[PDB]
């Protein structure tokens, strides 16, 4: 491949980044922000300013990787450093996380990365016999409530009940604890939402006019002091509920305090937060796929469970080919977290489809994942949601290009890499979610709107089996 100069520029100090931030949030939106510049520069690799800049991030300058050939450099821990860049070119105050740099911010070169990731692997393994029954019980209650709401209002808001369901499910599955039996009662979603806002506001729009939003959430950090008492309520819940997991933390040589803040983060930010994005997005894409797809899913799911004596098991799920494929297609089409960063550790040569680009040690690399996973030089019908895309031997090969977990779907998270520690769990619960929908319903209709995280979704019909 020819070596090309990396196109793009950062504009003037102060005003360049501000204009780019306006495009990103208001005048273009993320997808068109990136696509318009791919067109202008005739390149899927280019220099661009990323939010937040202002007084939140020291340096907004990145090299963007916007195709599925260049993007995977972001996974290579021998090429990129992954320290303090979970959220990009700024890091939320450690005052938001008990004074600790939490696992997700740690480079694999840091010894506590191995210890803490092992702790989460244990959490997940130890929960294995609780996941199915607790998912089925909590999500059954959710669909009961949605049917109730639909009967009253003619529509049922998914997100504002499903957030409670997700936390209750996680508390019961991971910790054998029903939040209703604790001081948290039903408050957890509100507490976590506020705390997440204090962490991620520089990256989000909350729908307000830019004249309000820009000074309020895009210029300076919200003060961590204002969420400390809410966080303490969460901390005490984890400290008191996570006894069994804290025993393993002790054996791994992690302090009780550090383990607790890490369990809180993994459960509330990584898991509950990721589910908050993923589940409504899944309802949106599956809804749009139409009733014929719904009927095919219902037929497969119900037939398979019947073949399994009515027992839903991991092996039964492996028979649900369309279901597995639909879940992967949600993850490919609409990666729940679009932004992955990595700082070049050394000088690199980054290959794209038609050229290679040289980057210097210290440059911040950034990838907008949807452009890698909807790359038409990798996927046919790239901008179409194709339920059956991953069905069969040939379809399954394409899983190497599904990147939602910050690594190929064909690869395994390890203590040596920065791939999502919960990769198998996410894919499992996403499958269980589809299964619970279509064991109950033949088909459904939805109404859709915007949300600061993910999508706002109402059900307008739920056709019972
Ligand atoms: C739908 C839910 C989830 C989504 C969308 C998601 C997504 C991601 C992504 C994109 C990353 C890469 C972050 C980066 O460096 O840029 C990540 C990392 C991580 N996730 Fe997940 N995740 C989810 C659930 C979970 C669960 C269930 C766990 C429980 C262990 C978890 C724990 C972690 C941890 C600890 C990291 C950092 C890994 C490391 O430091 O090596 N996440 N996740
Ligand atoms: C509340 C955060 C939910 C996602 C948790 C998941 O485990 C990984 C997070 C990774 C990076 C932190 C920034 C998350 C920003 C998500 C919304 C904007 C986007 O998609 O880039
Ligand atoms: C009015 C509150 C806005 C909701 C913020 C949610 C961000 C996680
Ligand atoms: C949009 C940010 C509002 C800040 C909330 C502070 C109230 C404790």
UniProtKB/Swiss-Prot annotation:
Q: Which GO terms describe its biological process?
A: defense response; defense response to fungus; epoxygenase P450 pathway; jasmonic acid biosynthetic process; oxylipin biosynthetic process; oxylipin metabolic process; response to fungus; response to jasmonic acid
- EC number of the protein: 4.2.1.92
Q: What is the first-listed, main subcellular location in coarse terms?
A: plastid
In terms of Gene3D superfamilies, this protein maps to: Cytochrome P450 (1.10.630.10)
Instruction: Report the InterPro entries cross-referenced here.
Output: Cyt_P450, Cyt_P450_sf
Catalysed conversion reaction:
(13S)-hydroperoxy-(9Z,11E,15Z)-octadecatrienoate = (9Z,13S,15Z)-12,13-epoxyoctadeca-9,11,15-trienoate + H2O; (13S)-hydroperoxy-(9Z,11E)-octadecadienoate = (9Z,13S)-12,13-epoxyoctadeca-9,11-dienoate + H2O
Q: In which pathway does it act?
A: Lipid metabolism; oxylipin biosynthesis
State whether keyword Repeat applies: no
**GO cellular component: a single term:** plastid
UniProt keywords (A-Z) are:
Chloroplast, Fatty acid biosynthesis, Fatty acid metabolism, Heme, Iron, Lipid biosynthesis, Lipid metabolism, Lyase, Metal-binding, Oxylipin biosynthesis, Plastid, Transit peptide
Molecular-function annotations in GO: allene oxide synthase activity; heme binding; iron ion binding; monooxygenase activity; oxidoreductase activity, acting on paired donors, with incorporation or reduction of molecular oxygen; oxygen binding
- Cellular compartments annotated: Plastid, Chloroplast, Plastoglobule
Where does this protein hold heme b? 82, 113, 117, 418, 420
Q: What does the sequence similarity comment in the record state about its family? A: Belongs to the cytochrome P450 family.
What this protein is reported to do is described as: Cytochrome P450 enzyme involved in the biosynthesis of oxylipin jasmonates, important phytohormones acting as growth regulators and signaling molecules for plant defense. Functions as an allene oxide synthase that converts hydroperoxy fatty acids to unstable allene epoxides. Catalyzes the dehydration of 13-HPOTE ((13S)-hydroperoxy-(9Z,11E,15Z)-octadecatrienoate), as well as 13-HPODE ((13S)-hydroperoxy-(9Z,11E)-octadecadienoate).
Name used for this protein in its record: Allene oxide synthase, chloroplastic
Q: What's the encoding gene here?
A: CYP74A
């Amino acid at each position: 491949l020819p070596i090309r100069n990396i196109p793009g520029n950062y504009g003037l100090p102060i005003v360049g980044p501000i204009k780019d931030r306006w495009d990103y949030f208001y005048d273009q939106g993320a997808e068109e922000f990136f696509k318009s510049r791919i067109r202008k520069y005739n390149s899927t690799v280019y220099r661009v300013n990323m939010p937040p800049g202002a007084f939140i991030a020291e340096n907004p300058q990145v090299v963007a990787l916007l195709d599925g050939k260049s993007f995977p450099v972001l996974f290579d821990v021998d090429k990129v450093e992954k320290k303090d860049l979970l959220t990009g070119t700024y890091m939320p105050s450690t005052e938001l996380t008990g004074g600790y740099r939490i696992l997700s911010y740690l480079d694999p070169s840091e010894p506590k990365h191995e210890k803490l990731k092992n702790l989460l692997f244990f959490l997940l393994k130890s929960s294995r016999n609780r996941i199915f029954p607790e998912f089925q019980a909590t999500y059954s209650e959710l669909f009961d409530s949605l049917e109730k709401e639909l009967s009253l209002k003619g529509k049922a808001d998914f997100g504002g009940s499903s957030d409670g369901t997700a936390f209750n499910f996680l508390a019961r599955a991971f910790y054998g604890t029903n939040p209703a039996d604790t001081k948290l009662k039903a408050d957890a979603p509100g507490l976590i939402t506020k705390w997440v806002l204090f962490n991620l506001h520089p990256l989000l729009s909350i729908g307000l006019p830019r004249v309000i939003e820009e000074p309020l959430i895009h210029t300076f950090s919200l003060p961590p002091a204002l969420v400390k008492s809410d966080y303490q309520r969460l901390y005490e819940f984890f400290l008191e509920s996570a006894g069994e997991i804290l025993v393993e933390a002790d054996k791994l040589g992690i302090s009780r305090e550090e383990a607790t803040h890490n369990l809180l983060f993994a459960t509330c930010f990584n898991t509950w937060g990721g589910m908050k994005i993923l589940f409504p997005n899944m309802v949106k894409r599956i809804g749009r796929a139409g009733h014929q797809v719904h009927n095919r899913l219902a037929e497969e799911i119900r037939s398979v469970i019947k073949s399994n004596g009515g027992e839903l098991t991991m092996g039964a799920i492996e028979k649900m080919e369309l279901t597995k494929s639909v879940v992967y297609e949600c993850l490919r089409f609409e990666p729940p977290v679009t932004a992955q960063y990595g700082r070049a550790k050394k000088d690199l040569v980054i290959e794209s489809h038609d050229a290679a680009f040289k980057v210097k040690a210290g440059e911040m690399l950034y990838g907008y994942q949807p452009l890698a996973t909807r790359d038409p030089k990798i996927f046919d019908r790239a901008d179409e949601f194709v339920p059956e895309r991953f069905v069969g031997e040939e379809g399954e090969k394409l899983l190497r290009h599904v990147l939602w977990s910050n690594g190929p779907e064909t690869e395994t998270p390890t203590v040596g890499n920065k791939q999502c520690a919960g990769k198998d769990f996410v894919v499992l619960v996403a499958r269980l979610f589809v299964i619970e929908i279509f064991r109950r319903y033949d088909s459904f209709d939805i109404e859709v709107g915007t949300s600061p995280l993910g999508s706002s979704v109402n059900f307008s019909s739920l056709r019972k089996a």
